[model samples]
Target: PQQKRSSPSEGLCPPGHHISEDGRDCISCKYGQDYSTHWNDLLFCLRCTRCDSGEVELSPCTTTRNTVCQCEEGTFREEDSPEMCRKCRTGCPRGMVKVGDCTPWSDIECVHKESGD
Candidate 1:
């Protein structure tokens, strides 16, 4: 289902403030949420709502909100993924050859080595 920011604190954020729901400080300025609160009652119980692994505390939940994807960064990928995207396996299928890899997609692409063979 399409999830709107139905949480009561959605619009509580003010200009030049941040939500920081990851239970930690936000890394990206635009990628993080922002909010305001009463004195000494700050909270960040929300999940990141981004990233494949459901890792919390990420920023820019929507593509429209943030142009860059979290994974596009050189850091994390899917759960159990390495620090970076792995290179495609060297061996291609029969009559197939690897052309190149996805720069930030964490995978490689291949095509038939000999077409019409």
Candidate 2:
């Protein structure tokens, strides 16, 4: 299929990254042949640009559905991924302290120690 070159906003990869914009699956993302690729297998396509922001994201159209995002003990959910677990704000439940937040989603984290007022 003859693919057209579109801006990264089109949700498809640009002319580079060796992605066929016509929407073909590229193995380059998983094998690491190209570290700057975002392929969405479920969406039946791939992303063109590399997210420069220092954050983690889902593997584009992931194989599984209803994926959830959870923050590590000391860490917090910082980014947004439909496939990723939502940002975790309320911690241990016993009680928590706001050590950090997951901005945008408007959520904060609690350490399970001190309670926030």
Candidate 3:
């Protein structure tokens, strides 16, 4: 089956399908390629493009499902897969304190521990 390339969009469909543009008609969305999160739209297919991302295959890719890249500690990323856990600095400037230590989802910030508010 020929596939079309387009911008990523959420979609609704069952395993190994794309729930065609026409009602009751099914299209192709190879489980070997993509996974469309189910919904009630004019069903479409969407999934990992950068599945070939940085090391850390801990996401455990399942058939018909893509990797959910939750980067490791000391690194952080917003989406599923990234070039790697986007590095988070561990060092705080002198006389300053750091917040959000090793929280992959939240950004780490360095603030002051001095007597000022």
Candidate 4:
């Protein structure tokens, strides 16, 4: 009796797997994982990241993706990187006035006061 060894590719693949939808590989993305989107394994799934205080979830992370965060209203982060959200500027110059409030992406916009026009 001879039980021949399976190919390396076959051994790498887990049970209940075959040629994937694209017919390029044997790995099939599970419920918590998407196609080459996030860190995952054929043997295990991925966990999503969380949004912290003063931050809002711009895009919720999926099993196969990372969360996109934005500062809450009235707050902002100077840089786009994953830094702490800071308070918005509340005061303007004597001759300048607040035109638009601060947003998660940008700071407050100020304009000069027109005496008559």
Best-matching candidate per lDDT: 4
Give a tens-digit lDDT track for model 3, residues 51-70: 33443455643435676555
The order of the candidates by TM-score, greatest first, is: 4, 3, 1, 2
lDDT of 2 by residue, 67-100 (tens): 2233333334334553333445444344445676
Using lDDT, rank the candidates from best to worst. Answer: 4, 3, 1, 2
- Alpha-carbon shift of residue 101 in model 2 (angstroms): 1.5
For model 4, how does the per-residue alpha-carbon lDDT over 35-74 read when each residue is reduced to its tens digit? Answer: 2353222443344556788888877655345677778998
Q: Which stretches of candidate 3 lie over 4 Å from their true place?
A: 1-16, 20-24, 40-44, 52-65, 78-85, 113-117
lDDT of the candidates, in the order given: 0.40, 0.38, 0.55, 0.57
| Residue-level lDDT tens digits of model 1 in 62-100 | 312432334543333545664544443445667766676
Candidate 2 lDDT at 55 equals 36
Using lDDT as the measure, name the better of candidate 2 and candidate 3. Answer: 3
Q: How does model 2 fare in lDDT? A: 0.38
Error of 1 at 31 (Å): 13
Model 4 residue runs over 4 Å out of place are 1-47, 80-82, 112-117
